[PDB]
Each structure stands twice: as structure tokens, then as C-alpha cells.
């Protein structure tokens, strides 16, 4: 995949100490060559090309867990949240935080958006709820009037959400500590508190994303396997069952570690599946052409020198690339934003 290392940035230090590495970074996202990254008490906006950190926002004691961009009609707002259950929407270009939503009383695991009719924000927190917010249009004074559209109850802690590709505003998939489920997010139904519509059968699911319009890439921990299953065939096979085995398309061989919270991503335009491992490698799968199939390439942790010494051991949690797959970011538990071209 002709990938080369372009930057190794340490910009989320605690106490602004260059010696802070152990702090773990959790999520990153490209603005609709600009990437936002979060971890520790800071949210950073980084130019993958030049390596300059464009913006940094610090809130005391917070351990940010998710960031996501959204293009609003014309501000590309950045949403961040974390330990304190508060969703902070930052106008990065303008350089200040516009509003804060006190979404949950427990930690917010991760955030998501979709091409919903507008300004939707699913928030998945440890209180076992996924709340759908309509943050509304900002008034002349950069103020938001957030509304609650719907509350999803989960049998376990949700970890990652992926709106259904072919109906992103009708059904939602979410990875939870008890497995994966599908929730009906259609607005025309009147009921506001909805349980999981269908619980899927393949244990926690720490990685979940669509490879293309119909194929879902998912993974857990302690299985060394990444499952590919079709959304269309599963939904056709549902009927009225609340528990439904998925229609598996293929399995991909992955590291056998039992460690959790290793998330995956995709680059649909290139038919790629990305997932970091406990050795800091990036496992890449080109499933276009596609027994446990092998990874197409393993991008080993190049052991960059830190303080004059190599950082020999670490872990990569999140890997995200742009639609054209010109830049790939891998976040580590070592306060290093690994950037690859």
C-alpha cells in the first residue's frame, strides 16, 4: 500500500510535559488534510501534511473519547466529548467553543453523525443510553438550543455507532459490551424510548464499520477474527426475531489478543479495512477481490526515537484515513499521533 511515515507528533501532553507518553489517545477524524485528534485533557486539530497543530482546546480533568466533524449550512463544526458526559461543539476555524450540551451524567463513550436530514448527533455513554440530539441552528450569537429526539436503551455499554449505509436516518447500528445491535432511528414513529430492535449473533464488539454500501466490518476481542456480513441479507432474514444470526460473507485473520477497545475503520472508495493492534502495527485488508483470510499488509510500528531512544512498545487504538486514502492516521497509547502518507 506504499505507505510512508510522515509525522510523529506529541501534542496531548499532560501538564504540558514533553515526558508524558503513557497517556492514551482515543479518536481522530478528518474535517470534511486536516485531522482532529483527542486524548487526555486536550482536543487537537492537526495538518497531516505539514505536521503543525492548528488548534488545541483544553478542559480540566477530561479524558476525551470521541471527536467528529460536521458540515453545517457554512461552518465545519467539530464535536468533542468525554469523561464528563458533556458534548462540546467547537467552531475550530473561528477559534472558540460555541456551546456545551450536558448530555449524560456518566462518561460518553463515543459520538457520531450521519447524513440525516440535519445536525443529528448520536451520543453513546456508559449510562447504557444512546441519545439522539438535534443541536439546531446557531443563532447570531453562536448559541445552540439542543433538543432530545429519542433515547435508546442498551443492554450494555455502547462503544461505536455506524448509521446504516442505505438508510442512515432509519436504522442505527451500535457496538456494545454485550454485543452488536440495530436500533430503529426513524422519526415518524412516535415512541421516544426504544429498546434494541435486533440483537445480532456472530461478547463485546470493539470495532464496527461498513466497508461498502452493503458489507459490514466488525470485530471483538480475543477472537483473532474480523467478521464481514451483509446488511441487506441479514435484514431480509430478520422477520420478527429479536435475535438474528448474521449472514457472514468472510472472516479476516487478526491478532489473537484478548485486549478490548481496538477499533477499526474503512476507506470505502479503496475497499479497505483498517485496524491497529497491540504491537502498534496497522492491519490493512483490501476486500475487493474477497477459512480466515490474511491481511494484505501489516504496517509495523517503526519504533520512532523519543527523547533520543526508540519507543519500542506501544498500542494503537484508532486508525482513520481520508476517502482518497492519501493520508492515514494511527493513534497510540503513547501520546503520539502517527501520520502516514
Amino acid at each position: 500500500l506504499h505507505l510512508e511515515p510522515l509525522h510523529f507528533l506529541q501534542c496531548h501532553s499532560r501538564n504540558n510535559s514533553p515526558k508524558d507518553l503513557e497517556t492514551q489517545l482515543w479518536a481522530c477524524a478528518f474535517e470534511p488534510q486536516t485531522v482532529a485528534t483527542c486524548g487526555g485533557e486536550a482536543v487537537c486539530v492537526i495538518d497531516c501534511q505539514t505536521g503543525l497543530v492548528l488548534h488545541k482546546y483544553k478542559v480540566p480533568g477530561e479524558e476525551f473519547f470521541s471527536v467528529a466533524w460536521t458540515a453545517l449550512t457554512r461552518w465545519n463544526m467539530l464535536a468533542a466529548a468525554g469523561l464528563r458526559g458533556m458534548v462540546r461543539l467547537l467552531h475550530v476555524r473561528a477559534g472558540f467553543c460555541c456551546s456545551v450540551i450536558r448530555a449524560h451524567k456518566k462518561a460518553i463513550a463515543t459520538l457520531c453523525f450521519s447524513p440525516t436530514h440535519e445536525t443529528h448527533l448520536f451520543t453513546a455513554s456508559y449510562d447504557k443510553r444512546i441519545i439522539l440530539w438535534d443541536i439546531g441552528v446557531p443563532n447570531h450569537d453562536y448559541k445552540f438550543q439542543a433538543s432530545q429526539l429519542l433515547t435508546l436503551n442498551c443492554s450494555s455499554v455502547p462503544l461505536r455507532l455506524c448509521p446504516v449505509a442505505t438508510c442512515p436516518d432509519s436504522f442505527l447500528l451500535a457496538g456494545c459490551e454485550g454485543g452488536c445491535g440495530c436500533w430503529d432511528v426513524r422519526l415518524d414513529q412516535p415512541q421516544k424510548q426504544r429498546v434494541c430492535e435486533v440483537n445480532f449473533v456472530f461478547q463485546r464488539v470493539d470495532g464496527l464499520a461498513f466497508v461498502n454500501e452493503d458489507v459490514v466490518a466488525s470485530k471483538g476481542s480475543g477472537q483473532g477474527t474480523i467478521y464481514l456480513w451483509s446488511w441487506s441479507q441479514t435484514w431480509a432474514s430478520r422477520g420478527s426475531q429479536s435475535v438474528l444470526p448474521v449472514v457472514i460473507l468472510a472472516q479476516l485473520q487478526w491478532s489473537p489478543t484478548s485486549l478490548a477497545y481496538f477499533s477499526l475503520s474503512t476507506c470505502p472508495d479503496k475497499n479497505l479495512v483498517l485496524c491497529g493492534d497491540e504491537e502498534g502495527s496497522v492491519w490493512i485488508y483490501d476486500v475487493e477481490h474477497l477459512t480466515l483470510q490474511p491481511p494484505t499488509q501489516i504496517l509495523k510500528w517503526p519504533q520512532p526515537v523519543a527523547l533520543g531512544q526508540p519507543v519500542t512498545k506501544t498500542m494503537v487504538n484508532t486508525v482513520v484515513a481520508n476517502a482518497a486514502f492519501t493520508y492515514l492516521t494511527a493513534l497510540t497509547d503513547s501520546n503520539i499521533v502517527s501520520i502516514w502518507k
Binding site: 506529541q10 504540558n16 497543530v53 488545541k56 477559534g95 467553543c97 520512532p304 526515537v305 523519543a306
Partner: peptide, 18 residues
Amino acid sequence: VPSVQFVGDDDVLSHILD
């Protein structure tokens, strides 16, 4: 292989404020 580049609070081009 590039080494790890430290970016302190004074290295940021801009700070986001409340």
C-alpha cells in the same frame, strides 16, 4: 524514520477559547 516531535502549548498556532 521521523523522530517524535513534541508540540507544547506555546507551539500551537492558535488556542481554542471558551
